[PDB]
Design a protein around this ligand. Structure first.
Ligand SMILES: *[C@@H]1O[C@H](CO)[C@@H](O[C@@H]2O[C@H](CO)[C@@H](O)[C@H](O)[C@H]2NC(C)=O)[C@H](O)[C@H]1NC(C)=O
Ligand SMILES: *[C@@H]1O[C@H](CO)[C@@H](O[C@@H]2O[C@H](CO)[C@@H](O)[C@H](O)[C@H]2NC(C)=O)[C@H](O)[C@H]1NC(C)=O
Ligand SMILES: *[C@@H]1O[C@H](CO)[C@@H](O)[C@H](O)[C@H]1NC(C)=O
Ligand SMILES: *[C@@H]1O[C@H](CO)[C@@H](O)[C@H](O)[C@H]1NC(C)=O
Lengths: 321, 162
């Protein structure tokens, strides 16, 4: 009559490492490392990402003729840009504090586009129709940004204009405008008859006077002239004034906007999807409880920590025999 | 590995015993078979479970959007940013790798311990009434049937015999 004691074993082939020994076969274990994404740009909280498709942030906000058909939204958790998006600033120029703009737009609570300066009642002493160019083509025809109006002089006249809008909204308003720098002094008087002109844009916080820099730049999209793009956020109850003797690409549409800090912009080809996720990567979303992931370093949301590990198998069972 | 039991004086495990992690194999006149220790296996599972839950549950990350955008004239902050990313990467990789290693050595030692303890609990209970073989097995001098089995398992072993 015998009564002994021992342990457990099986067909398990799981191997773990210890401080003292490598490749030790164990009966049971679990993986602490996540290495599997759904390959979908799933949404974050329950809000969907703003996918720009063929356009970038610049093109979308300025109103590039191509960036027509994506923007019927009110909010987004983050912004998605495709690596093959190039429809941005069709007219050559510098977008001042562009990266900053993108960061601020990365996540928006509410977002409505309203006409701040209606084309037809606001610019009565200037031509608001001749402001097109071959640089911003809409099906062959010469067009321009939708959200901006390129004000040229009406039949040999450009009186000092002076419009000013006051934020009657209950949220900040993103106002964009442009300063055009003609290539030649002949182009200058051709567009806004005066030779020595100036633009001034001011609010309770913003204030700057612009002097047109007339010169010949290397042709980019047929234009030897440049166009600098500016923006600002006018506070609720605050007003922004414009004042120009020429060269002012005036705002047409502004954006009532309530933003929440702490999101980003993913540049990826991956498909946008109707799905829920708590952690988003450029390659796909992560649905995980595990502490670590080796999928991608760049991440958005509440994600596992990025590790360079290939495997992190944790032993749960004992040895195997 | 540390308590001399598993892969020690008991060199082998029982594919046969599939009820728990630790358990006996009786060999009396009413038959044979394996029987996993109820209380021991249950506690181990609970505690090992708690162990796994801790390593996981203690990871409450902040809502952050890694990755920033810098223009050609901001290569310096771009590299600063890259540095903070490569720093966290090195810390977390190293810590995670060693956490698993260290814990894996504790887990096997934990199991090894429970076996040793099960053996000892039986041994300090049968004293003269049986002898050690050395293979984690005892030999009874006194006829031990099935209900004479359990008194050992239940830990309720009388002592009137020879
Ligand atoms: C993931 O997003 C959230 C979960 O937090 C869910 O949100 C609602 O889904 C219903 C069903 O269509 C809608 O009627 C609600 O309006 C959604 N909420 C919001 C904020 O709009 C959503 O259903 C989840 N989707 C999946 C695929 O799990
Ligand atoms: C949208 O982006 C594409 C990417 O360049 C632009 O494509 C070009 O289209 C214009 C319009 O005539 C041509 O002049 C170029 O030669 C095209 N490039 C190629 C590859 O042929 C397109 O212009 C953009 N849309 C607009 C109107 O800005
Ligand atoms: C031993 O296990 C380690 C896991 O750290 C693995 O990298 C390695 O390839 C294994 N070596 C052999 C010979 O199986
Ligand atoms: C994904 O998330 C759901 C809801 O939390 C969860 O029940 C499920 O286990 C997850 N599936 C995957 C892909 O692991």
């Amino acid at each position: 009559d015998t009564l002994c004691i021992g342990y457990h074993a099986n067909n398990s082939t799981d191997t773990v490492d210890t401080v003292l020994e490598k490749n030790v076969t164990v009966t049971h274990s679990v993986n602490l490392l996540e290495d599997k994404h759904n390959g979908k740009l799933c949404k974050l909280r329950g809000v969907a990402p703003l996918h720009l498709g063929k356009c970038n942030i610049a093109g979308w906000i300025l109103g590039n003729p191509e960036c027509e058909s994506l923007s019927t939204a009110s909010s987004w958790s983050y912004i998605v840009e495709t690596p093959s998006s190039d429809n941005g600033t069709c007219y050559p120029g510098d977008f001042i504090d562009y990266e900053e703009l993108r960061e601020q737009l990365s996540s928006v609570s509410s977002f409505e586009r309203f006409e701040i300066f209606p084309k037809t009642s606001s610019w009565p002493n200037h031509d608001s129709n001749k402001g097109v160019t071959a640089a911003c083509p809409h099906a062959g025809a010469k067009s321009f940004y939708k959200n901006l109006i390129w004000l040229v002089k009406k039949g040999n006249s450009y009186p000092k204009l002076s419009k000013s809008y006051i934020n009657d909204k209950g949220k900040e308003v993103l106002v964009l405008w442009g300063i055009h720098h003609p290539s030649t002094s002949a182009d200058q008087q051709s567009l806004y008859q005066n030779a020595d002109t100036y633009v001034f844009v001011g609010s309770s916080r913003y204030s700057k006077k612009f002097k047109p820099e007339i010169a010949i730049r290397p042709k980019v999209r047929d234009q030897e002239g440049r166009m600098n793009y500016y923006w600002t956020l006018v506070e609720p109850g605050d007003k922004i004034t414009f004042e120009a003797t020429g060269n002012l690409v005036v705002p047409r549409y502004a954006f009532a906007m309530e933003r929440n800090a702490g999101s980003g912009i993913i540049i990826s080809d991956t498909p946008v999807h109707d799905c829920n996720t708590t952690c988003q990567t450029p390659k796909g979303a992560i649905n995980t409880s595990l502490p670590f992931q080796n999928i991608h370093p760049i991440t958005i949301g509440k994600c596992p920590k990025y590790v360079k590990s290939t495997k992190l198998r944790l032993a749960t069972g004992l040895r195997n025999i | 590995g540390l308590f001399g039991a598993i892969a020690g004086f008991i060199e082998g495990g029982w594919t046969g015993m599939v009820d728990g992690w630790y358990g006996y194999h009786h060999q009396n006149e009413q038959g044979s078979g394996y029987a996993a220790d109820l209380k021991s296996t249950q506690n181990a599972i609970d505690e090992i479970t708690n162990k796994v839950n801790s390593v996981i549950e203690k990871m409450n990350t902040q809502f952050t959007a890694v990755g920033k955008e810098f223009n050609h004239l901001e290569k310096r902050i771009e590299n600063l940013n890259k540095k903070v990313d490569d720093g966290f990467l090195d810390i977390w990789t190293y810590n995670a790798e060693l956490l698993v290693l260290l814990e894996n050595e504790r887990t096997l030692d934990y199991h090894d311990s429970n076996v040793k303890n099960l053996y000892e609990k039986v041994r300090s209970q049968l004293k003269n009434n049986a002898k050690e073989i050395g293979n984690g097995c005892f030999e009874f001098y006194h006829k031990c049937d099935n209900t004479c089995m359990e008194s050992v398992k239940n830990g309720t072993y009388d002592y009137p015999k020879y």
